[PDB]
């Protein structure tokens, strides 16, 4: 039904210019006034740009004014987003939403009833850098036993995310992937993977590891020892 | 601008439980008070408008109500499918301000964690870093302490912890303790502990190993 999906997020330089974009479906596109929202990275969602029917007027909350700019092309079904002179305060989740109602009459109208998924804006001096991918292997007499753990160890890579997935996904339970941590401006996180320590060493499993941001593709074999 | 305050960030509750999140506004906001719920890695989803209007797929047992400066959302049989973080925001005063959020736990029985250590790999020997790594996983509830020992000794230095969010199947919470060294100060030791201090056990889960 009704769909809205950002786009244009991405690392950027303190000082920068980054231009989002959300194309909608499943209503007249039209008829709402539209807005952006963000996310922020202690989960603090904060206004950014309103815009009414016929680009006529917009808003931007002092945090965002005179820097943001907000526009929509009404034949595309398309809004956007211009952000300029960027710190690491904009650092955050952007969403597209609409109101409940196009009709001030209409209370749904004070209300934003759809979101998009949000697109990721990072406003950082630091570095894309691949991770380095490290095996978890027991050691070295502990072989006891209905069960056993193996893990991944993610290190050193920016920026977020990584996606961490075990024999290519063929193994999905008794999987936990943890929350990375910084250190040194570069992330670190862990995987586990539960499994009967009958299928292994008999038996292979073995880490897959993206990290779209800088293009790497990292598989890990654990092996005894 | 508005301040919307939500009193607690963490809300804990058992399924079929009813659970009441608080918000308050700063100022006489009269019925512009809307409704919001999030999950974990989710979108963000419109639950009650103005002070008590449910969006059309909301469940029933879902109710807003409050006018002025307090409101309350009111969820009747908590489901899992309600564990998400609740927001409250005012659309009336410029610029529209949300609440800091109150993030909703399940309640479930006592599980003891599984705790695995693991030393550092040749791979990473071959780059002059040492890291150590701990996981606990699968316990509950929540509160855990982690002890690291090298060779009988505490330490705190290059300790990292990492949470997971409450488990989906089985309601658990997972942590990671990582002991990152210099290889050169990984040599000059033999021993290295995990200890466990949790709520099921008296007597720490230790899991240790030496070279
Ligand atoms: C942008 C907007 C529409 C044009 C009109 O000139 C008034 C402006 C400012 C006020 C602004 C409307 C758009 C509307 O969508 C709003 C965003 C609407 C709100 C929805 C909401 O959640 O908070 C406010 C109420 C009114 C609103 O805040």
């Known amino acids: 039904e009704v769909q809205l999906v950002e786009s244009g997020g991405g690392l950027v330089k303190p000082g920068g210019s980054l231009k989002l974009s959300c194309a909608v479906s499943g209503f007249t596109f039209s008829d709402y006034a539209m807005s952006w929202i963000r996310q922020t990275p202690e989960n603090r969602l904060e206004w950014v740009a309103s815009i009414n029917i016929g680009a006529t007027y917009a808003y931007y909350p002092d945090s965002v004014k005179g820097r943001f700019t907000i526009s929509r092309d009404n034949a595309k079904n398309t809004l956007f987003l211009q952000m300029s002179s960027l710190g690491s305060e904009d650092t955050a989740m952007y969403y597209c939403?609409?109101?409940?109602?196009?009709?001030?009459?209409?209370?749904?109208?004070?209300?934003?009833?759809?979101w998009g998924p949000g697109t990721s804006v990072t406003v950082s001096s630091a570095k894309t850098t691949p991770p380095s991918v490290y095996p978890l292997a027991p050691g070295s007499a502990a072989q006891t036993n209905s069960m056993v753990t193996l893990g991944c160890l993610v290190k050193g890579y920016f920026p977020e995310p990584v996606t961490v997935t075990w024999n290519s996904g063929s193994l999905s339970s008794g999987v936990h992937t943890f929350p990375a941590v910084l250190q040194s401006d570069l992330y670190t996180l862990s995987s586990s993977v539960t499994v009967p320590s009958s299928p292994r060493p008999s038996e292979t499993v073995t880490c897959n590891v993206a990290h779209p941001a800088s293009s790497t593709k990292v598989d890990k074999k654990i092996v005894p020892r | 601008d508005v301040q919307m305050t939500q009193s607690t960030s963490s809300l804990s509750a058992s399924l079929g439980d009813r659970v009441t999140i608080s918000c308050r506004a700063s100022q006489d906001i009269k019925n512009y008070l809307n409704w919001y719920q999030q999950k974990p890695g989710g979108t963000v989803k419109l639950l009650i408008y103005?002070?008590?209007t449910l969006l059309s797929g909301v469940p029933s047992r879902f109710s807003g109500r409050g006018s002025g400066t307090d409101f309350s959302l009111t969820i009747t049989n908590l489901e899992r499918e309600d564990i998400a973080t609740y927001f409250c925001?005012?659309?009336?005063?410029?610029?529209?301000?949300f609440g800091g959020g109150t993030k909703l736990e399940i309640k479930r029985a006592d599980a003891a964690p599984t705790v695995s250590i693991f030393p550092p790999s040749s791979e990473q020997l071959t780059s002059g870093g040492a890291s150590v790594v701990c996981f606990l996983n699968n316990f509950y509830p929540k509160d855990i302490n982690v002890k690291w020992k090298i060779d009988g000794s505490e330490r705190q230095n290059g300790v990292l912890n990492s949470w997971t969010d409450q488990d989906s199947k089985d309601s658990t919470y997972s942590m990671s303790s990582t002991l990152t060294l210099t290889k050169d100060e990984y040599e000059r030791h033999n021993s290295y502990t995990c200890e466990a201090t949790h709520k099921t056990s008296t007597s720490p889960i230790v899991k240790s190993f030496n070279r």
């Open positions: 103005y002070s008590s």
């Open positions: 939403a609409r109101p409940g109602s196009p009709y001030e009459y209409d209370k749904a109208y004070y209300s934003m009833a759809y």
């Open positions: 925001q005012q659309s009336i005063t410029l610029p529209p301000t």
